C-alpha cells in the first residue's frame, strides 16, 4: 500500500492491520518499526508499494527519503537511495521524491527506491532544468500577504491589529521580539490560521525547535499544512537536521516558482543548538557563543527573499528577550538589523491580560510603500501619528477598543476620519 497513508493512521489501526495480516508481537514496538514490519510482510506478497518523502543526502554520498510525519526523524522505514539516483537525476537536499519502492535485499537494511515517479511535485525532466535558488536575484517584497479573516470574530482582532501595525509581504524577513509570557504562541497560531485561510496557494511551513510535546500536538492539530518539530528531549544535532531539512525543502520549492512561508519558533533556540553543535573556533564572545557558531543561523535567516523570476520565500521568525540568559541576549543583539520586518511584544500589555501585546509605537516594517497602496499608506501614517504621543499600554487599549465594533479595516479608517 501507499507509505504516506500508513504514517497517518492511528497506532491501533496499524496494530489491527498487522494482526489481521498475520503478524504478531507488534504492540510493544515503536510506530516506525510497526510500519517497517507491515511493509515487509506486504512486500512478501510481491505487490506494488508506493512511497514519498524528502531526500536528505549524507556525507558518504547516499541519501534517505525522510518523512515529514515523524518530523524528518531517522528510522527503519526510511527509503534508501544510492548515489546512483542522485547522479542520474540531479537531486539536492530537500527534493520531494515520490515513487515506487522495493523491500530490502540480503545485506540491505532499509527500503530502496525502484522507479522515481515525481520529483518536487513535477516530472524529473522538467525538475532537473530548474535554476538553483542561489542564482535567483533577490528583490524587495511587493505583494502583500493580507491576513485579515474578514468574519469579524474576536480571533481576527489580533490579525487586524498586526496588519495595522506592520504589513506582511511575500518574501518578507520577519522577526518578533517576544519576551516570556507575552502570548507569542497564540499570536503564531492566529497568524497560521490567517495564512491558511486568506492565501491557500502559499505553502505554509511551521517548524518548532526546542518545544514541549503538548505544543507540538496542538500545533499539529490546529494548524493546517505541514508542521515539523523538535522537542527538547532530542539533542542539538536533531535541531540542526530539522532546520536544515526544512530550509532546503523551502528553497527547492521556491525554485519551482512557489510561495513558501516559514514560521520559525524560535531563532534563539536554533542559534543555541548551532552553538552547541559547532566545533570550537577559539574565539568566544560574551555568553559562551562561538563566533563561527552564529554564522550558521544566518544562512537560514538570509534565505528569505523575493525571487524576481517567480515565487518567494518568507520567514517570520521570533526571538527571545530578557529570558535571564545572556546567551540569548547576545543572539538577539547580533540579529538586530538583519530583518526588514520587526514586531515588538511587551510584557506590560500581557500582564494586564489584554491581547495582543504588540508594541505599536516601536513595531513596523521597512519599504512599506511597495506592499500597501497610496491612500492606505496615508491612513496608516495618520494613525501612527495620532498613536505616537500616547502611552504604550494606553495606545494598545485605544487600538483595541477602536477596533472593537469595526468589522473590517477600511470602515475603521472611515470612522476614524469621520
Amino acid at each position: 500500500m501507499n507509505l504516506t497513508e500508513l504514517k497517518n493512521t492511528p497506532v491501533s489501526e496499524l496494530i489491527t492491520l498487522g494482526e489481521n495480516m498475520g503478524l504478531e508481537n507488534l504492540a510493544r514496538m515503536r510506530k516506525q518499526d510497526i510500519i517497517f514490519a507491515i511493509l515487509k510482510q506486504h512486500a512478501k506478497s510481491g505487490e506494488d508499494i508506493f512511497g514519498d518523502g524528502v531526500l536528505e543526502i549524507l556525507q558518504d554520498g547516499f541519501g534517505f527519503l525522510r518523512s515529514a510525519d515523524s518530523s524528518y526523524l531517522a528510522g527503519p522505514d526510511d527509503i534508501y537511495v544510492s548515489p546512483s539516483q542522485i547522479r542520474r537525476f540531479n537531486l539536492r537536499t530537500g527534493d520531494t521524491i515520490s515513487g515506487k519502492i522495493r523491500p530490502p535485499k540480503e545485506g540491505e537494511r532499509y527500503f530502496a527506491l525502484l522507479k522515481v515517479n515525481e520529483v518536487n511535485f513535477d516530472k524529473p525532466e522538467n525538475a532537473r532544468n530548474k535554476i538553483l535558488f542561489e542564482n535567483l536575484t533577490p528583490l524587495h517584497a511587493n505583494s502583500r500577504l493580507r491576513m485579515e479573516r474578514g468574519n469579524g470574530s474576536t480571533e481576527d482582532l489580533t490579525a487586524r491589529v498586526l496588519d495595522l501595525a506592520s504589513p506582511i509581504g511575500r518574501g518578507q524577513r520577519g522577526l518578533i521580539v517576544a519576551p516570556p509570557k507575552a502570548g507569542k504562541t497564540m499570536l503564531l497560531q492566529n497568524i497560521a490560521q490567517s495564512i491558511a485561510y486568506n492565501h491557500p496557494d502559499c505553502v505554509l511551513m511551521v517548524l518548532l525547535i526546542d518545544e514541549r510535546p503538548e505544543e507540538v500536538t496542538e500545533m499539529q492539530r490546529l494548524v493546517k499544512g505541514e508542521v515539523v518539530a523538535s522537542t527538547f528531549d532530542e539533542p542539538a544535532s536533531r535541531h540542526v537536521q530539522v532546520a536544515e531539512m526544512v530550509i532546503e525543502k523551502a528553497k527547492r520549492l521556491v525554485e519551482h516558482k512557489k510561495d513558501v512561508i516559514i514560521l520559525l519558533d524560535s531563532i534563539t533556540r536554533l542559534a543555541r543548538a548551532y552553538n552547541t553543535v559547532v566545533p570550537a573556533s577559539g574565539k568566544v564572545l560574551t555568553g559562551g557563543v562561538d563566533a563561527n557558531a552564529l554564522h550558521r543561523p544566518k544562512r537560514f535567516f538570509g534565505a528569505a527573499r523575493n525571487v524576481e523570476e517567480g515565487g518567494s520565500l518568507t520567514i517570520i521568525a521570533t526571538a527571545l528577550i530578557d529570558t535571564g540568559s545572556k546567551m540569548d541576549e547576545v543572539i538577539y543583539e547580533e540579529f538586530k538589523g538583519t530583518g526588514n520586518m520587526e514586531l515588538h511584544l511587551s510584557r506590560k500589555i500581557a500582564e494586564k491580560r489584554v491581547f495582543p501585546a504588540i508594541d505599536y509605537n516601536r513595531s513596523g516594517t521597512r519599504k512599506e510603500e511597495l506592499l500597501t497602496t497610496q491612500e492606505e499608506l496615508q491612513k496608516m501614517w495618520i494613525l501612527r501619528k495620532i498613536i505616537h504621543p500616547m502611552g504604550e499600554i494606553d495606545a494598545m487599549e485605544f487600538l483595541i477598543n477602536k477596533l472593537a465594533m469595526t468589522k473590517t479595516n477600511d470602515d475603521f479608517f472611515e470612522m476614524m476620519k469621520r
Binding site: 542520474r88 522507479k115 522515481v116 524529473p124
Partner: protein, 82 residues
C-alpha cells in the same frame, strides 16, 4: 515511441558493471546475443544512452531496448517494460 526510464536497481547494476569495467552480454529485443564491453552511460536531452563496443566501435544504445544480461558474479536481471 515515448522513452521510459529504466528501474533503479537495473540502472544501478548496469553502472556497477560500467565502473567495474567487466565483460558483458547484451540481448536485444529480437533475442540476439552481443558479447561486448560497456564503457560509459551518458544521458543527453533527457534520454540516457550507454556506449558499448564489440571491437572498440563505441556504439550508443538506448536503455529501454535492452532485454536482459548475464554474468556469473551478478545474478541475471530482466528489466520491466511497464
Amino acid at each position: 515511441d515515448t522513452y521510459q526510464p529504466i528501474n533503479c536497481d537495473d540502472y544501478d547494476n548496469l553502472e556497477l558493471a560500467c565502473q567495474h569495467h567487466l565483460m558483458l552480454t547484451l540481448e536485444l529485443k529480437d533475442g540476439e546475443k552481443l558479447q561486448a564491453k560497456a564503457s560509459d552511460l551518458v544521458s543527453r536531452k533527457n534520454v540516457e544512452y550507454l556506449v558499448v563496443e564489440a571491437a572498440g566501435e563505441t556504439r550508443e544504445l538506448r536503455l529501454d531496448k535492452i532485454t536482459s544480461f548475464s554474468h556469473p558474479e551478478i545474478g541475471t536481471v530482466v528489466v520491466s517494460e511497464s
